[PDB]
């Protein structure tokens, strides 16, 4: 483990056969500065400050991912088609702020130890699927080369609220429901 | 473009050529590249660098401490080094990231050292016909310039350096021909500043 | 190195042209350039993993493509006279590494094939004044009346191509500078010792290789079809 | 305008539940004491197996597992690929860090401190950067017993969160205060409960 005051990943490059799909992002101190929309060829910075003062060419990301596609095929053959091992993700649900009735807040679903990076994170309100007011981070890197991903549920705290984070992953026997305890 | 260079530059053969380049708006993630192009050939890669000095078999590259200017040092300039030398910053700019955009460059002229200049204008007869002839201005000093003709029916070429490698001898030459009756080798190069001691044989 | 075909091309207005480029073995990035006397060396587009990346500022008539073997082709549609240029291909190991250029494809767009002429070649023997004054003998070769400028001049002494003592004009001379498709004149010099010239066994041949029309093209003019051919003039040594 | 770059990856030697084959490349930069100690480590990963890496402290590509000798030996034989990777310590790590000084490293988000219930929970939410000191004080005496603190919680939206609990037996006049120090705060935030 390298000890340092700051760690940057100027190039989390990801490509996988399932899909197939890829991801390009830069991280600084464990947070995502931007990802590149590979389909729309756009750099998507994650803070207003970054959008105003920092610039990254998406073509650099598209080129690197194309190399990853070629490198993947080569190492698939070299490894006798050794497939990825499905890990069991661990799910934690918590709020961004202390919860007060009527004060808009956010529920945070941390899905940790993801591998392969193929996951379905959805929210349930009283058993009903929530399809709006939900956002998500990209896959964020980890030093053991697995990933974690965070999903956000904006909500207006009320007395009769039942929220769950439903996670679907090949490493799970069944979809995992993580009920949010109001705390 | 991020580079400016002097348009033309002369160098004596056997000396080293120091071609300057300015690039004050260069970024810390951009390299400096040097190319050249001889005549009608494809451009030739020379050298590149970021901050340090670099040397390969062909040249050295000196990038100043502030990286705002650089110099290409061509050792032992030869006639084959006469070319346009392009200093290019390989920019890191949206939509053209990694591009090598060529500018006007520097036209380098490696002047041969004519130790015993013997300028003369000879008349050469055609090997097949007898009326056809050309006038040859040869063995003149490298500091002499051959200017184009006045009439469109008089054709004059530019200087050309031949190298008799077996005899350790180099000589400039220019050819002139026409068919205007009033054309003669005595007045073929009157538009150029011909040396006064030029040998005009009868 | 980088291989580019065809080396010399002659088209008329409104036709299309396809230029092929073989990158250095192992190289995967390919970049195209157009070089004109006017605009200079201008960037067209760049390819990696069979898809176009960075692009220059040329109209849609200029398109390209890269195959899975990293070879690239380039196409120009509805050709105009101003499209006549040198078309250069360059490759690099990866995208962003040092690019290495090929020799290029010389395209001449002509108003009509009737403007294509092979060269006439003449060799002028050295003057006896130069021989007695310098003990050297300069031969001059004149290639005149050719168009386009798709020509390779070489000297052949006793059936062997020589390069020492040779100087060929780097750029041709236009016989009618005011005309756009004017025919060209080109001179070259071969200088030998007086003793070598005075040997009657030595012969000096100026060879001009002309790249012109193909045998499959249509030809209506009364003169000979200006096909790809060698035209040469020769002179034999002589004592005096 | 001008753009920053990332690590340029090298190309592999080859020419040319559902199962999944995953490839990762990480261009990683480590900074210490400002711009005084910089280190570049590019990582080549098959699934979760890092098989080849370049370490700027080493200077050449090295194989990590038996899967990487062909890649490492080939990338080390390509002079420009090796030299450009070494120079990424300057063109990527040192360059982008200068842009972090203008932006990320100057980002200051002041924490929000609230207390609620015996057990007292001091919620310190939405702060950046990740350096914080939370201490419980009872009547101007820093509590040093029965204080369980959650780990630093990363929200993923460039804010952090931490919750420090204090098991306390309240008494007449006992005033409990949560003290929070943070780089965005010239003076520590003090929140009383009593
Ligand atoms: C692994 O490769 C060996 C030969 O290298 C082959 O015999 C074997 O069948 C391969 N593994 C599988 C699961 O096919
Ligand atoms: C969600 O993702 C899982 C991956 O574990 C996949 O098997 C499933 O089909 C996905 N479901 C939907 C509705 O996309």
UniProtKB/TrEMBL annotation, chain A:
Disulfide bonds: 109-165
Location of the Ig-like domain: 89-169
The keyword Ribonucleoprotein belongs to this UniProt entry's keyword annotation: no
GO cellular component, one term: lysosomal membrane
Assigned keywords, A-Z: Adaptive immunity, Disulfide bond, Endosome, Glycoprotein, Immunity, Lysosome, Membrane, MHC II, Signal, Transmembrane, Transmembrane helix
Cellular location(s): Endosome membrane; Lysosome membrane
Bilayer topology term: Single-pass type I membrane protein
Glycosylated residues, chain numbering: 80, 120
Any one GO biological process: antigen processing and presentation of peptide or polysaccharide antigen via MHC class II
Family as reported in the entry's similarity comment: Belongs to the MHC class II family.
Protein name (database record): MHC class II HLA-DQ-alpha chain
Species of provenance: Homo sapiens
Shown part of the complete sequence: 2 to 184 of 227
UniProtKB/TrEMBL annotation, chain D:
Keyword rRNA processing recorded: no
GO biological process, alphabetically ordered: adaptive immune response; antigen processing and presentation of peptide or polysaccharide antigen via MHC class II
Cysteine disulfide partners in this protein: 29-93, 122-178
Location(s) in or outside the cell: Endosome membrane; Lysosome membrane
Glycosylated residues in this chain: 33
Topology in the lipid bilayer: Single-pass type I membrane protein
GO terms under cellular component: endosome membrane; lysosomal membrane; MHC class II protein complex
Domain Ig-like: start-end pairs: 111-194
Protein name: MHC class II HLA-DQ-beta-1
Gene: HLA-DQB1
